[PDB]
Ligand binder design. Structure first.
Ligand SMILES: O=C(Nc1ccc(-n2ccccc2=O)cn1)[C@H]1C[C@](O)(c2ccc(F)cc2F)CN1C(=O)Nc1ccc(Cl)cc1
Ligand SMILES: [Ca+2]
Lengths: 234, 50
């Protein structure tokens, strides 16, 4: 996350972190339930084997509230390709259930029509993660969050060098130096409604980070609500 | 209806028979007033205080 602010205690409890065999964070995730994590399909190519850490806000030190969970089943959308980055979505079934506590809780999955008319017509969403705090920088030690404006769909088709599909949406700023970045991919985009936070996006891709005339690109969760539900039951 | 301040619902709003029907995400129950969503601890979408 470029710019934004630190997640303070309890502010971003649905943030999950995918960690490699070196216990190093490479992608984000969203807690959906005690057994299920939402992430990006493209994160699944970034590590041979990986685990999920919940409850972390500062990776330098182990405070006590953190917990690591092994992955039982990986469910990657069968239409994802690196060529387009379309269908950039995966769901993980964990081997052991998450214990909800301070800094550990799920975000709500909304209903499709209500989400599109009520959440996505909001002024802003919130993106979070441990990714780089600048384009050329190192992975962040602290969990950060950033309010990102929703971006007019034509405005961001015009801005993109790659095709923006209907499974994507744009958020962030034209010139202001705030954005998600590499290492934040897979993580939460949530929208606040009456002090309740609903998952609306998965951090997907962007051209660099925080670039002038470029936006952050997110997987549209509302396009996959039925696929997510199916993945969580079958 | 749902176009007017979300039909006064806490969460989901649907218009059935030209009247508002509110509902809630998993782990919430619809209050007696048919509008508020009551957590059934650590309900989805709430920042954690303890
Ligand atoms: O993988 C990246 N970018 C990327 C990947 C794929 C595509 N892409 C999209 C559609 C079709 C094909 C395709 O390759 C575009 N950008 C990395 C390298 C990246 O482009 C990059 C460039 C120069 C740098 F010096 C450092 C970087 F990290 C930035 N990336 C990134 O994912 N940024 C990002 C992601 C999410 C959000 Cl919300 C905001 C920013
Ligand atoms: Ca820690």
């Amino acid at each position: 996350i470029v710019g934004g602010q630190e997640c303070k205690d309890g502010e971003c409890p649905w943030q999950a972190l995918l960690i490699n065999e070196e216990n190093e964070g490479f992608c984000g995730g969203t807690i959906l339930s005690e057994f299920y994590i939402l992430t990006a399909a493209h994160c699944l190519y970034q590590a041979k084997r990986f685990k999920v850490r919940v409850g972390d806000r500062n990776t330098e030190q182990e405070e006590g509230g953190e917990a690591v969970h092994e992955v039982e089943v990986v469910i990657k959308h069968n239409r994802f390709t690196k060529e387009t980055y379309d269908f950039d979505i995966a769901v993980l079934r964990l081997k052991t259930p998450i214990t909800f506590r301070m800094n550990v809780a799920p975000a709500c999955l909304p209903e499709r029509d209500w989400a599109e008319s009520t959440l996505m017509t909001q002024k802003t969403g919130i993106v979070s993660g441990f990714g780089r705090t600048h384009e050329k920088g190192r992975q962040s030690t602290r969990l950060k969050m950033l309010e990102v404006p929703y971006v007019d769909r034509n405005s961001c088709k015009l801005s993109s060098s790659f095709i923006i599909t209907q499974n994507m949406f744009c958020a962030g700023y034209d010139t202001k130096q705030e954005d998600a970045c590499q290492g934040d991919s897979g993580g939460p985009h949530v929208t606040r409604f009456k002090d309740t936070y609903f998952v609306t996006g998965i951090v997907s891709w962007g051209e660099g980070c925080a670039r002038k005339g470029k936006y952050g690109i997110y997987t549209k969760v509302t396009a996959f609500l039925k696929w997510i539900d199916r993945s969580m039951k079958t | 209806l749902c176009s007017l301040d979300n039909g006064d619902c806490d969460q989901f709003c649907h218009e059935e028979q030209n009247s508002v029907v509110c509902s809630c995400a998993r782990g919430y129950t619809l209050a007696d007033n048919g509008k508020a969503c009551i957590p059934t601890p650590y309900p989805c979408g709430k920042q954690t205080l303890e």
